[PDB]
Symmetry: D2
Subunit: 197 residues, 4 copies
Amino acid sequence: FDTLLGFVELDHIYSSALKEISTKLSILDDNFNHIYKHNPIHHMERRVKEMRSLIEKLNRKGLQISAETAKEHILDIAGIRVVCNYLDDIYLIEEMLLKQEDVQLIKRKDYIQHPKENGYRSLHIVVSIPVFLAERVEVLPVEIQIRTIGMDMWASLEHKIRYKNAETEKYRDLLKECATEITEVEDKLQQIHSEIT
Amino acid sequence: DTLLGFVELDHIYSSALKEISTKLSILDDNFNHIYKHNPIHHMERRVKEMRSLIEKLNRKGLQISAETAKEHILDIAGIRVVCNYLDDIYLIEEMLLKQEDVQLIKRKDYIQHPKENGYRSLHIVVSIPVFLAERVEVLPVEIQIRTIGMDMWASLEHKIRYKNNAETEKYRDLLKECATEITEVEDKLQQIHSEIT
Amino acid sequence: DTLLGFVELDHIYSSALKEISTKLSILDDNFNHIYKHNPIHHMERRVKEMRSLIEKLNRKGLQISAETAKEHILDIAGIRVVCNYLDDIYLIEEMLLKQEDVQLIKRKDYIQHPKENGYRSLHIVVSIPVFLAERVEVLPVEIQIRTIGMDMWASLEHKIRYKNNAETEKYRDLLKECATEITEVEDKLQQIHSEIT
Amino acid sequence: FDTLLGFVELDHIYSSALKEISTKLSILDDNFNHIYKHNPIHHMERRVKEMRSLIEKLNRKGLQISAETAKEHILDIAGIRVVCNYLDDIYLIEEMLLKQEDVQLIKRKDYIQHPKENGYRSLHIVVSIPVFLAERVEVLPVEIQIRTIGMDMWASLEHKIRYKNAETEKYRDLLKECATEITEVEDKLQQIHSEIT
């Protein structure tokens, strides 16, 4: 059906958006290491929301179900997580990214500055990037989650408890202890690395 | 010190290659999504090694430094885009050059007018911005767009000149015949492919 | 349940493809280190999708399950090894089949004896052990070894049959001519390459 | 010089060795995730010792300097670090690897069972693997260091203090605190993950 075709196109163009941001981030990481001897980025992961998740979300909001609706109302269709070696790399990567001429900052939420009640810590920014296609240019939003390795280890276990669902409450306070415990050890590693660089 | 400049040159022109690769990969994928055909067969990136920069500077009587190479050699970074069919070459060019941040610097169409020795390729030098940690660099990249068959020829011819160049005269008439025979069969394959699409 | 078997089939035959890819990549690299020439131009792996397994099972009147497919279809996993020159094909075969953990199952040389329609490739089915988390599987893999030119032909011919197959008769005489013309030029390029090496 | 050639060959064949082990590990990781919903491996890194480090080491031992000497006396010429998500993945990966028919265990040292005085924790195993080359098979040793993410974060900062050299003593006891602090939080994450899987 015609409606179906748009969502296939949607997956493809947002994947291209991820390619654009990944290359910028890789170049930033690589040049920081060249000038300096430190790679701010440990690894990255990319994902594009599955069409079924998009329709569900659109259904939830009571909106007309098409790809054009999806673009307008869901801005983390494309997501990239940037896992950093040290806490200062997180803020630093953001500065290096957002000062680029063709990167527009759309939304920002700093769960490192303001941790979640559960203990989740990450830096969330939505940015827009031009994507040049065969016969047009698309300016597309991309959700970038920037975090430390420890933050990433915490968030993945928490996530694995939630979706797979009564266990979350059972582990809620102990996961908060780990989020606190992970924060503390990462600032000690941060301040040792700050001193020697 | 002089040597460091060339390491810097390699690094930043390699970053330029990543930027242009991503654009091309996105074009190829979008072209395929629209017309059910992948124009690009493969790509190969290369930065000219410092010894290839110096002899070219020497041949021009230029002072031997990375900044002189930067100013005077526009194929320091080169990417070969190998296409499945001859008409794909000109579609990749059109799709690339209409991007606002891609500027055409030089163009020479050895497909429209082959070299006497039989060589064919479309050469365009374009400029691309590279966003680094603490500065932006606009760098030229030489793009050689050719068919698979043109690439097989050029690789062998390139493998006649560099190793034991004296024989370049010995095979010149036979390599011209092969270039003609490759052209002939690629036009037949092009028109069979055009008819069914 | 039946569906799960096929997901398992895809996964383990994909692992077989990784094992054989690594062997071939190591052979290519070592051949290059000794003789200053890379025999392999590129490779493409593919697992036949479940719909391609079922119709083949149906065509044979076989019960529709992953275990029946496993027993009766030896090209579930296929890798195409595209070589730079015709003589490289037989050297890759010899180098691969002498490995103690590679067993030849089937061989058919369409280069020595092309198909009437013009197709050429060397087909060998080999078995490879795949070491999994909790068991070892010895799985067959169909390897199609061909030159770049053979690959261009087969891709177009393959693109005549599957989409709008009626025209397969229309282009049959013209595709035969192209296969002949590709053979002729690849033997000239082979002998120029052999002489300088 | 003739001696030089052997060391070039050495780098190449030990790199092939790394390719063989990487593929096995990737298949193990991927199959564990298929059967179970957990990827034991977070990431891997490969390195082959630089020729200058090999000569220095041979010089240190007062041995004749050739590639053949190097193979005999240096068994971590090829090294792969396997960074695991949880502490139990480390032991588990080892079991899955060493039960494979063509993997021979050569040496083992468990710094997780027995931490270093500084606080370093990792599992070190040297294994041998057949590498099939163009015209021979080589059974080559490979050093595999298996560790947790936290262990890897600890070890990299410690390493960055040592090579870059009076700072090591300054940070010695504080790095020991982090090694202890990292251990504690990783066993809490381990026991939460053990309970829900």
